[PDB]
């Protein structure tokens, strides 16, 4: 079965556990590119009550850095918010929560905006049929496949 975070039968808990970056897409490139802010390394997701626990790791010069953030359930179900360079809320549109995770973020930073996307799955990487999904699931939100970039040959330390 697949679900949505905003989703009347959504089961966060059903999202626990190892995951890891698959691809990520962003309608400001720059942000997602080797030295983005956004270009994170998912490891694993802790459900909590009303949060959710993201580890991370960041790459520069070929060297891992560990990041860990909270993201916090805001009033919109399914929508969660959490700080980190700039104000950022996600959902997640799609999920079959044993293979892969899509989310969708709005980062609001100095004033502006952008949208992040990103796929995520419980192996080191996923099906061409999934990854297709995805770029599907970006243009829906105006996002280019020139701005999706597939990161499963770089996700590992
Ligand atoms: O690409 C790093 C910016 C935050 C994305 C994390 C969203 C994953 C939702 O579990």
Redesign the pocket.
């Known amino acids: 079965e697949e679900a949505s975070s905003t989703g009347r039968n959504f089961n966060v808990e059903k999202?626990n556990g190892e995951?890891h970056?698959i691809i990520?897409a962003s309608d400001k490139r720059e942000k997602?590119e080797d030295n983005g802010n956004?270009?994170?390394f998912?490891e694993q997701?802790h459900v909590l009550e009303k949060s959710?626990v993201?580890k991370?790791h960041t790459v520069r010069d070929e060297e891992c850095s560990e990041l860990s953030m909270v993201?916090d359930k805001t009033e919109k179900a399914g929508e969660?918010s959490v700080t980190?360079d700039g104000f950022?809320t996600?959902t997640?549109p799609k999920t079959d929560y044993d293979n892969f995770?899509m989310?969708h973020?709005i980062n609001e930073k100095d004033g502006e905006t952008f949208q992040?996307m990103?796929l995520?799955g419980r192996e080191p990487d996923l099906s061409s049929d999934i990854k297709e999904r995805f770029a599907q699931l970006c243009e829906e939100h105006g996002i280019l496949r020139e701005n999706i970039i597939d990161l499963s040959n770089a996700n590992r330390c």
């Open positions: 999202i995951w970056t990520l997602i956004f270009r994170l998912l997701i959710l993201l991370f993201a969660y980190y950022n996600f997640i995770l989310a973020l992040l990103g995520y």
